[PDB]
Amino acid sequence: AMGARLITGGTVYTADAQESVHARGAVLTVDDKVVAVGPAVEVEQAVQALDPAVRAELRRLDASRMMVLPGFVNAHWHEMFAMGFTMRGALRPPSDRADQVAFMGGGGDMHQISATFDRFDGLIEAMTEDEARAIAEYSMWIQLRGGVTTLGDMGSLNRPLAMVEAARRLGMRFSASTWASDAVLAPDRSRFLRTRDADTVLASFEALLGAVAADPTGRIRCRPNVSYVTNMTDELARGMAELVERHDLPFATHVGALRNEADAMRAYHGETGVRRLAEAGLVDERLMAGHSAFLDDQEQKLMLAGRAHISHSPGKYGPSGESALTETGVVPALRRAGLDVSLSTDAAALPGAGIAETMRAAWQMYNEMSADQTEVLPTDALAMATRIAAKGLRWDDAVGSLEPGKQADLLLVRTDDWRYLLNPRPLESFLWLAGSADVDTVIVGGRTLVEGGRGVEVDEAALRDRYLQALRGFTTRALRVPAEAVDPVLAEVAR
Amino acid sequence: TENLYFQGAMGARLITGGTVYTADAQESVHARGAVLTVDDKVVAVGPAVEVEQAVQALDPAVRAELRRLDASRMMVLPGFVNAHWHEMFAMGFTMRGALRPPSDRADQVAFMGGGGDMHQISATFDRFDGLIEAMTEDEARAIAEYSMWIQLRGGVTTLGDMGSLNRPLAMVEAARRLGMRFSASTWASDAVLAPDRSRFLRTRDADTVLASFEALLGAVAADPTGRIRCRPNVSYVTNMTDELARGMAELVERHDLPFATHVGALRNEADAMRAYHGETGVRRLAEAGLVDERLMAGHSAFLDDQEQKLMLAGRAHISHSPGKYGPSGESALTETGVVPALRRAGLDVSLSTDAAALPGAGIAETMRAAWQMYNEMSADQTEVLPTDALAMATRIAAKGLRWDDAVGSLEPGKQADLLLVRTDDWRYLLNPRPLESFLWLAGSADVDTVIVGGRTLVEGGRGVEVDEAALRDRYLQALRGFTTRALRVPAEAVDPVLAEVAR
Ligand SMILES: Nc1c(O)cccc1C(=O)O
Ligand SMILES: Nc1c(O)cccc1C(=O)O
Ligand SMILES: [Mg+2]
Ligand SMILES: [Zn+2]
Ligand SMILES: [Zn+2]
C-alpha cells in the first residue's frame, strides 16, 4: 500500500469538469486514490480526517516550486520502435536536402499505406517474444518519461502480450489492442482484396481480452481497433460492432485521415470511411476516430449525432506531410460544435512529439486558424490530453483528472526557472518553453515511477541497451537490413 | 572602449566530434564535423579529419594555445539571428502579464486577436514615446539587460530591435555588457487612428522621429566591438505619415542602411488603412520607395496580389513569427497562406520570435512551429526541411538584417558565433539528424553553450560572465519602479507578485 501522500504548495491543474486551477493548491492521496484536492487549507482538513496510523506515516512533498498536472492520457499511440532502422529512421543521410514527399504526404499514397498496414501481421509473427518485450518496454518507458500515465494502443508493430508485460513491469496504465487488417487496396484491382477472415481477426482480439480479463492491478484494459478503414471489410466492421456491444468496450480506428482516402474508399469499397463505419453501427459514443478531418457534411453530422470522439495529433502532421488540421478545418469546427476532441501523439519508429509538444501545437495552431487566443486555452489543451482523452478511452471512471475518488496519477514539473518567472499561469509558460523532458515526477496509483526526470525502479540505460540488442536482431533477421549497415550505427550510440 | 566589457583575445579553438550544421549556402551538415576558430572568426569547418589538417597549418604559437572542445556528445549550430524582436519586459505587469488570474477560463479575444482592434493597437503604439521618456536610465539598463540575456540564453547571438519600449542606448549598453550582437533601433510612431476622426491624427513631427534615429546612428558609429549596428524602423504602417515614410527612405539611402516595419499583420488592417490613410500598407511603403531589398517586413501576410507582386519585384524580405500567432489571436499564417506562397515564389522569408512582456517562444520554438505548420498546410514534409528552419533563423535572417557579411553561417571568414546542444539523451538516440530530434523534443532551454566572436558566454546552460540571479533581481526592482510610477499600477497589486518570486 502507498499510504497517504500530501503534495502541497504548487499550482495544481485538476482538469476537473470546471478545468479548476488552484494556486498554492494541494493533493491528498491515500493508497491508489485522490482523497482531497483544492486550496491547501481545505486539504489540511482532509489530512486531519485520516486514520491516525495512516496520518503518522503521511509523506509530505513541498511542491511550492512546482506545477501539479493530472497524468497524461495518450489514447492514440502505436508501438513502432522495431522499425527504427527503416521508417524515417537511423539509416537516413544526415543531410535532409534530398527528402521526397512519400507515404502519408502529398494527400497519401493509398496503395502503399494499405499494403504496409496489411504486412504488420507477418512482421509481428517474425518478431521474437524477447525482442517484442525489450522494444515495447523501452518504447513505453519513453511515453511514461514524458508524463503518459495511461497509454492507448491503436495498432502496433509489436506482440500484444509483450506490451501488456512491459506496462505491468513499468507500473503505467495500458489499453492493449491487436492488429486488425483484413483487406488491401492493390494497384492491379478495381475492388478491395480480402487478405484474411474477419472472424479469425476478431478471435485474435478475443484471445487478448481473455488474457487481461483476470488483471488485478487495475492498470490493464483492452480496446479493439481496426488498423484503417481502407483495410476493413464490412464483415470485420459488423464483427467489431457485435464484439464491443457484447463486452461493453470502447472501439478505435483511423478514418478521414488523408486527402486521397475518400476517392480510394469509393473506388475499392463503394463508400467513404465514416459512412461505412456508420452502416456497421460503429459511429457512436464508443468510437475514437484517429485524425477524422476529411469528412463531408453528412459524415460530420453522423459523428455529432453519434457523440463519437476524435483523437487529433497536430504535433506530428507536418513532418509526415499530413494536412489533417488546416486543409479542411473540420476537427476544430467539430470541437466548437461540442464533439469530444482529444490530443494524442500518434507514433513513429524514433522519438517524436510527446503529449506536452502536442498540447503546445494545439494551443498555437487551433488559435491561429480562428484568430482567437481563447479557442484552445492552455487548460483546454491540458483537458484534451487528460480528462477528454480518458473519456474517449472509456477510462474517465478512474483517470484523466485530479478529483476525489479518481486514481492518484499525477505529474510534477519544476517552475522555479526563468521560463516561469512572474507568470501566474505556469501551464502557459510550460506550453511556451517546456516539453516532455521537463516532466520531473510521474506518480501512478500513488506510486512514484519517475523523480527528477529519472526512473525510480526503471534503469533507463539497461532498457536502452536491451532495446538496441532486440532492434539489431529484428532489423537484420526480419527486415533483412545488412549487419554492415546496422552495426556502425549501434557503435555510434553515446552510452 | 571594448575593454570595459570583456578582456583578452580568444586565440584558436577546435570544436570537434559532433554533428555540425553550417547553414552555409549549400545547407551543409557534417556528421563528426569540426569548427576551427581563431580569435573572432571561423577559419575551417568540415569533416573532423579535414579540419585537423587546418590545425596543423596554424601559426605555431597559436597552435600551442589551441583550446580543444570535445563536442562528440553535441550538435553544433550557427548562433541564432533573431532579426524581429521587441524589448517589452517593462510591460510584464499589464501585457498578458503578471496580474492575470491563474485560471484562463474568463480570457477574452482582445488586442491583436479577432482580426485586430486597430484603434487600440494604434493608440497603444503611439503611447510608447511617453512611456520610454518616463523610464529612468537605471530602469532601462536593468530591464534591457535581463530581457536580452533571456534571448542570449536561448542561443540568440545576433538580435534585431524592430521597436522597443526601452531606451535605445540602454539596449546598446546591455548588448555590450552581455557580449552579444545587436541591431539597435528607435521608436517611430507619428500618427494614430482614433475612433472619432476621418483621417489619421499626426502625433509628432516626422523630423523629430528621424532626428531620434540619427542620434542613435551617431552614438553607435564609434563602436569598436563589431557587435553593434542599427536599423531604422517604423512601428506599424497605421502609425506612419507619408512624411515619415519618405524621410525613412531618404535616411536609409543616404546612410546605406536596412529598413524594417510591420505591415499586412492583421485581417482588419487593410480597411483601417483605407479609412485613415486612403491606401493599404504595402502600397503606401511602395509609394515612399521603401519596398526594395533593404526592407524587412514583419508578418506581411495580409497582402493582395498587387502587394505580393510589389514585394517580389522589390526583392524585399519577410520576417515571420509562427511560434506566437495563436496565443495573440493572430492569423498571419493560415488565413491567407501568403507568406509560405511568397517563399515558394523565391522571396526571402526568415523566422523570428516577435516579443511579449514575459518569456514566450524563442527561436528554437519558432523553428519547430515553421517545420510543423508550413509542411502541414502544403501536405508536404519537404516544404520546410529542418535545415530550412535553421537557415530561416540564421543565414536568411542575417541577409534580411544586412549582417550576413559577418554572421548567420559557419563558413571561413564569418564570425565564430556558435551554439552547442547536448544530443546524448533519449530524444536523439539513433537519429542521424539531431536537428530533427531538437525540433521534435527540445527548445531554448536545451541550448548548452553559446559562443560569440570565439568567446563562451553560456556553458552548461549557465552564464559564464552573467550573474543570472543578480540580473533577475535588478530587473524585478526596475520593473517595480516603472510599473508603480509610469504605468500607475498600485504597489498593493505589484508587491505581492514580487513577494511570490522563487529565488
Ligand atoms: N497517420 C495515419 C494516416 O495519415 C492514415 C492512416 C493511419 C494513420 C495512423 O495514425 O496510423
Ligand atoms: N504582432 C504585431 C501585429 O499583429 C500588428 C502590428 C505589429 C505587430 C508587432 O509585431 O509589433
Ligand atoms: Mg473566423
Ligand atoms: Zn495512428
Ligand atoms: Zn513585431
Numbering used by the authors:
A (entry chain A): 0 to 494
B (entry chain B): -8 to 494
What did the study's authors say about this model?
We reconstituted the biosynthesis of the benzoxazole moiety found in nataxazole by adding two enzymes (NatL2, NatAM), to 3‐HAA, ATP, and Mg2+. We have determined the structures of both NatL2 (homologue of BomJ) and NatAM (homologue of BomN) from the antitumor nataxazole pathway. We show NatL2 catalyzes ester not, as previously reported, amide formation; the amide is a shunt product. NatAM catalyzes benzoxazole from this ester by a mechanism that we propose involves shuttling of protons to control the fate of a hemiorthoamide intermediate.
The structures of NatAM with 3‐HAA (1.25 Å resolution) and 3‐HBA (1.17 Å resolution) were obtained by soaking and show that 3‐HAA and 3‐HBA molecules superimpose, as do the protein structures, which are largely unchanged from the apo. In both complexes, the oxygen atom from the carboxylate coordinates to the zinc ion displacing the water. The other oxygen atom of the carboxylate makes a hydrogen bond to His290, which makes a salt bridge to Asp345. The 3‐hydroxyl group forms a hydrogen bond with Glu321. The 2‐amino group of 3‐HAA bridges the side chains of Asp345 and Glu321. The benzene ring of the acid group sits in a hydrophobic pocket formed by Met103, Phe116, Tyr227, His253, Ala256, and Leu257. The structure of NatAM identifies a water molecule bound to the zinc, but this water is displaced in every complex structure and thus seems unlikely to play a hydrolytic role.
